[PDB]
Swiss-Prot record:
Name the UniProt record assigns to this protein: Papain-like protease nsp3
Annotated organism of origin: Severe acute respiratory syndrome coronavirus 2
Gene name per UniProt: rep
Domain Macro: 1-168
Record text on activity regulation: Inhibited in vitro by GRL-0617.
First and last residues shown, out of full length: 1025 to 1192 of 7096
Biological role stated in the UniProt entry: Responsible for the cleavages located at the N-terminus of the replicase polyprotein. Participates together with nsp4 in the assembly of virally-induced cytoplasmic double-membrane vesicles necessary for viral replication. Antagonizes innate immune induction of type I interferon by blocking the phosphorylation, dimerization and subsequent nuclear translocation of host IRF3. Also prevents host NF-kappa-B signaling. In addition, PL-PRO possesses a deubiquitinating/deISGylating activity and processes both 'Lys-48'- and 'Lys-63'-linked polyubiquitin chains from cellular substrates.
């Protein structure tokens, strides 16, 4: 149903909220929820762990079947699979892990995948243990994504930092 509420409008197509992406998916019933994935779709930590646990492991079982038959994703790439109980579809997107020296230019490739979907619920890419500067990740989203993206950032201090920087 895509019923998003409580978001700040940053640009004509980019919105942000201090919220847990799992609770937003349960409330909003989005067509697409984005997962902050890794190349072998191992959903143990970060946003991926939160989304997988909220599907009671159904996302990991489906992801393992996909990897067995198709192999790993590329950094910057993506894959649409079921959204299970959280959304119609899950778009698994791999941003670069700059803590491991992956190419930060591939963060633009990662966000470019969102342009195939009219509206998405998403986390900020390459944050957490991937180590990209979060203000830079929001700027790449704003400059690359043309479709409607609703960003859920589940940390008040990071949300306030992002909003303050954007409004400068
Ligand atoms: C209680 C169950 N829910 C959660 O644990 C949870 C976590 C969470 C989240 N985390 C962000 C993140 C972590 C890793 N990689 C990223 N690309 C981003 C950080 C930057 C705040 N962002 C959005 N919603 C979220 N929900």
């Amino acid at each position: 149903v895509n019923s998003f509420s409580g978001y700040l409008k940053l640009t004509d197509n980019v919105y942000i909220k201090n919220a847990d992406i799992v609770e937003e998916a349960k409330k909003v019933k989005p067509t697409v929820v984005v997962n902050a994935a890794n190349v072998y779709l191992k959903h143990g930590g970060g946003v991926a762990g939160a989304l997988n646990k909220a599907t009671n492991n159904a996302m990991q079982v489906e992801s393992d079947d996909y990897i067995a038959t198709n192999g790993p994703l590329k950094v910057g790439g993506s894959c649409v699979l079921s959204g299970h109980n959280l959304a119609k579809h899950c778009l698994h997107v791999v941003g670069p892990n700059v803590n491991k020296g992956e190419d930060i230019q591939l963060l633009k490739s990662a966000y470019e995948n969102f342009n195939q979907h009219e509206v998405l619920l998403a986390p900020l890419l390459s944050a957490g243990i991937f180590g990209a500067d979060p203000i830079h990740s929001l700027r790449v989203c704003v400059d690359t994504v043309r479709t409607n993206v609703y960003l859920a950032v589940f940390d008040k201090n990071l949300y306030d930092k992002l909003v303050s920087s954007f409004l400068e």
